[PDB]
Amino acid sequence: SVTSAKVAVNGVQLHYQQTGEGDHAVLLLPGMLGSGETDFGPQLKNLNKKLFTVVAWDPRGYGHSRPPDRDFPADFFERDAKDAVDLMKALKFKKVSLLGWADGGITALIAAAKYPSYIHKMVIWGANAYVTDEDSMIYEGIRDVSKWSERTRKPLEALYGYDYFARTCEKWVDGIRQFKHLPDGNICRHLLPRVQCPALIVHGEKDPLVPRFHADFIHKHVKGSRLHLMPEGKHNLHLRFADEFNKLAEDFLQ
Ligand SMILES: [Mg+2]
Ligand SMILES: [Mn+2]
Predict the structure, then answer these.
(1) For the chain, what is the domain count?
(2) Phi/psi at 38 (nearest 5 deg)?
């Protein structure tokens, strides 16, 4: 049983889905153009409702957190990180664990580093702490949504309508590529050493969007972190291999 609602946070009405009665609060952070509805169905359904209280939020401009429309200023990951934590605080949780996917994992890393007393544990996958030429090329190949597979386009087209979906994807590409021009193509390399909570980095070895060196790098600089490789996992491993992933996550969080 899942409840959808909005809460006022930093000038925006953020949408989120909540389920479970557990004492361990968990926030699910979606990736680019994502939402709880499109990125975390299996988790909102199967994560242990007795152990956890699960919340899946929609970053401003994504999912149902519209208005406003999405924009990508240089600090957009930090803005999302603040919104995410403020949302959970608005919902009265005293401490929470984070499950972040891709852009959501980058967001989770930032939140753990900036608000260490609020984060218990963290599980991230498909995230990159910086942008390289190889990444830039990958992003460019994603820009045109019309060339996306029909299966991956359907859900987002239905949620946003073609126009917003196409336009926001282009702004995302320009928004994430902007980091390549900064020293070290940095997004959050500098915050990794500041993560103080136990972290589990999962990586699908067949992920075509995020080279494994990004997971190795995050693992290297996040003290006490654990890295788990899934031979058959791709970028959407928590969806394609939901049962396997959920077990990995639940075991780590306990
Ligand atoms: Mg450097
Ligand atoms: Mn939503």
Answers:
(1) 1
(2) -100, -25
Ligand 2 center–CA 243 separation, angstroms? 23
Dist. CA 154 → ligand 2 center (Å) = 17
Q: What are phi and psi of 227, to 5 degrees?
A: -115, 130
Q: Which residues form the domain of 141?
A: 1-254
Q: Where are the alpha helices (DSSP H) in the chain?
A: 36-39, 41-46, 76-90, 103-114, 133-140, 150-160, 162-177, 212-221, 237-240, 242-253
For the chain, what's the residue count?
Answer: 254
In which residue are the tokens 């075991």 written?
A: 251
CATH of the domain at 108: 3.40.50.1820
> To what resolution in angstroms was this structure determined?
1.9
**Ligand 2 midpoint to CA 111 (Å):** 21
